[PDB]
Amino acid sequence: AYTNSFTRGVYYPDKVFRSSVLHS
Amino acid sequence: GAAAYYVGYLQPRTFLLKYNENGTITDAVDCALDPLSETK
């Protein structure tokens, strides 16, 4: 079967708290 | 209770999140989805 996963799959790749900032 | 589930896959790709004021995640983009995303 095939379905489109729109936006999920995002998480915190680490244990550090970062606030109010863009980060790639 | 009849159930439905979905299976997806993770890849080693760079994502640009915006860490917001809450210490949370509210949106992110993928650097390999489309040509435009590379610009972001």
Next chain:
Amino acid sequence: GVLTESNKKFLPFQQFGRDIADTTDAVRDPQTLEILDITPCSFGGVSVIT
């Protein structure tokens, strides 16, 4: 640096925070679980008038 209690909010799996450029911002003590911003010691330049 100076230790000032962290007014910002954390998450249960979040031990310490960083703003940018490796400059760690906040840390929770590994014993009692209290959150604190850590500000680098106040510093400036000195000039003279001669």
